[PDB]
Amino acid sequence: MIPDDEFIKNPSVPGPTAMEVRCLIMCLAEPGKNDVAVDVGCGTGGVTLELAGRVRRVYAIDRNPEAISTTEMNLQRHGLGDNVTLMEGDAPEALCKIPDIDIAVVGGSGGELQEILRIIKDKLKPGGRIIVTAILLETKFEAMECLRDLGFDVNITELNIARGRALDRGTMMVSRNPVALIYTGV
Amino acid sequence: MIPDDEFIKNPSVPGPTAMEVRCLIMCLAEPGKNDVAVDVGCGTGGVTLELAGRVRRVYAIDRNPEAISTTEMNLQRHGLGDNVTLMEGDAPEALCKIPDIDIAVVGGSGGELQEILRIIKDKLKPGGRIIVTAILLETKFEAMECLRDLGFDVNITELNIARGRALDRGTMMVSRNPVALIYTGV
Amino acid sequence: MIPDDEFIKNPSVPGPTAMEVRCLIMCLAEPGKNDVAVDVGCGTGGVTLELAGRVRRVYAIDRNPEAISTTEMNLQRHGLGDNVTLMEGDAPEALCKIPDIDIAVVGGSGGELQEILRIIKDKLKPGGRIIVTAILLETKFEAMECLRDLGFDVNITELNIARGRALDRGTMMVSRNPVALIYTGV
Amino acid sequence: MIPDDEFIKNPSVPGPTAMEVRCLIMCLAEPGKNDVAVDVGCGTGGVTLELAGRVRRVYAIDRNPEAISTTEMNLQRHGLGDNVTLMEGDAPEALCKIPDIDIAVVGGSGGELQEILRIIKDKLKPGGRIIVTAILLETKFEAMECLRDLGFDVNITELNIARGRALDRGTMMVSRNPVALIYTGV
């Protein structure tokens, strides 16, 4: 997996998602080379990158132009992007212009989460997977609720990662903020 | 990834390792189809399974006969095992009968961790990766120390996972015990 | 603090709350010998005990008879209870029969959390503190939301505790499930 | 408890210790108004503060002059310090100039942890308590080992705290680095 260090950040663009989380999302999404995926709120490009290398097509969406810019840069740094359709603008509008999906990774809460999820449920091919990355306590709840309301079997996994930082004095554990992955049964 | 639920457990055999951890081990190990791997202390077979599907050869070792038995069963349930050499008995003895390795996943502390690590360092192909799964606070330290003494750049990641369990009353977060992954730089 | 071990458990009654959590609730609640406190959903009696020894009066409420029973037993084992009014039945009904409070520790989600909180806000003496112990992901959200809606400054602290268990092989870290303490500014 | 916010920090002086940890240390230490306590490596003064208000005497030690300086300031901001003997210099040297102790809170690993612990064991009144705050993975192990070697019953509790930070977008959980408290049975 591309570690967080090899990502070109941008002060106004959140990310990249911790490799440990990207790790897990990849396993939950269980990409197939014929799967069409959508990464809503692609940020620095973390998930898009990982998906780019394992699925047929990836539609990366984000309101923030700098994010599409950063994701673009990062795809190029890692020579991916041939199969990645970057998309500027409002997630719900963008999502309508997309084909049906097998995998949906929704990071960007962007308020309109419930709307995005409804849209996604409608474009989800049978056996599709939705994975919502929640940073805000509200998103954890809202995602759980929507997914259940859209008739999905919802699961949730909260990841608390700590990496050691070598100091002269020794190895200190440094925490990433908790990240929850709300995902629908396959 | 095969979820913990699809594993055939055995009351006397610990495991399977949380999918979230197996997930991360897979990313840290970064299996190559030409990589030879060894899973010391294969338990229920979790890591062996994951590795089986991504590397050339996997040598699964474990003192406990029931573990070799359970891993054997689980390999079959998931149609893997063709490239998995199961091995009974003392890990250091078994390890000497193995070819050089690219990836080493050492779970089974089995006391003799330091000895296993020494053996492994000697059979580690250049650019090889060692990942020690530590359940015991002592193994976290002992592994860090050996790895550093054997001249490796040691890193550590503690994973605290919680999965929601749906109750009538609502979703409750249930913790897995902390698991640390001590790993050598690639 | 009375450690979890010295509590008389009851298979049908959840608790006691990890000493680490009780410890923190005690500090957030900042009991004063003249403070009147209410422990909604007193379970095994953990918080009731701690409060009993530091405040003027403690009203312990719980739907479950076994819990009032168990809390009663534990109060006696530790010679407290002189200043503890145990209360059987529905929390909202019981809460109305109570005097105004300085401290409110709400553990028992019991569905009716929002109602309990509204009742509590109305009986909260100026400078009072509310602390809701959340086990369920929904309660974390719901409590945050209510407290904010009732005009409180809401804070949240998620505790992930792990205690070592000495085995022959060594000390192993054992996790308690995550517990969140949603509390109102003083 | 004095929250982390009301502490006068100093860029070169680590601390204050998270209120959640200070909270727990106070409970494990179980101060008595007649207890003599020593805070080795007093940092910003967190523990010293808490102890100051509950025990007879507190000897605060720290190599770093800025730390004794900052602790000094903080004691004054909170009108404590009348019963606090600040001490400059090498912890082992300072420790010999102290009377016997009931409570010892050792934060400052300062390398010489094992030496400090031996000294403390010798000055520990019967039924005394030692609590070592470990930030470094090495200290967790070393403390456990010494305490056991000095014939103490050693216990350990790893605390992973996350506090919500209110953003416009919502509440986000922010982690403190893991902190372990190794403590001797009373």
UniProtKB/Swiss-Prot annotation, chains A, B, C, D:
Keywords: Cobalamin biosynthesis, Methyltransferase, S-adenosyl-L-methionine, Transferase. It catalyses: Co-precorrin-6B + S-adenosyl-L-methionine = Co-precorrin-7 + S-adenosyl-L-homocysteine + CO2. This is Probable cobalt-precorrin-6B C(15)-methyltransferase (decarboxylating). The keyword Cytoplasm does not apply. It comes from Methanothermobacter thermautotrophicus (strain ATCC 29096 / DSM 1053 / JCM 10044 / NBRC 100330 / Delta H) (Methanobacterium thermoautotrophicum). Pfam families: Methyltransf_31. Homotetramer. It is an enzyme of class 2 (transferase). S-adenosyl-L-methionine binds at T17, G41, C42, G43, T44, G45, D62, A91. InterPro entries: CbiT, Cbl_synth_MTase_CbiT, Cobalamin_biosynth_MTase, Methyltranfer_dom, SAM-dependent_MTases_sf. It comes from the Archaea. One of its GO terms (biological process) is anaerobic cobalamin biosynthetic process. Its EC number is 2.1.1.196. GO terms for molecular function: cobalt-precorrin-6B C5-methyltransferase activity; protein methyltransferase activity. Pathway: Cofactor biosynthesis; adenosylcobalamin biosynthesis; cob(II)yrinate a,c-diamide from sirohydrochlorin (anaerobic route): step 8/10. Belongs to the methyltransferase superfamily. Archaeal-type CbiT family.
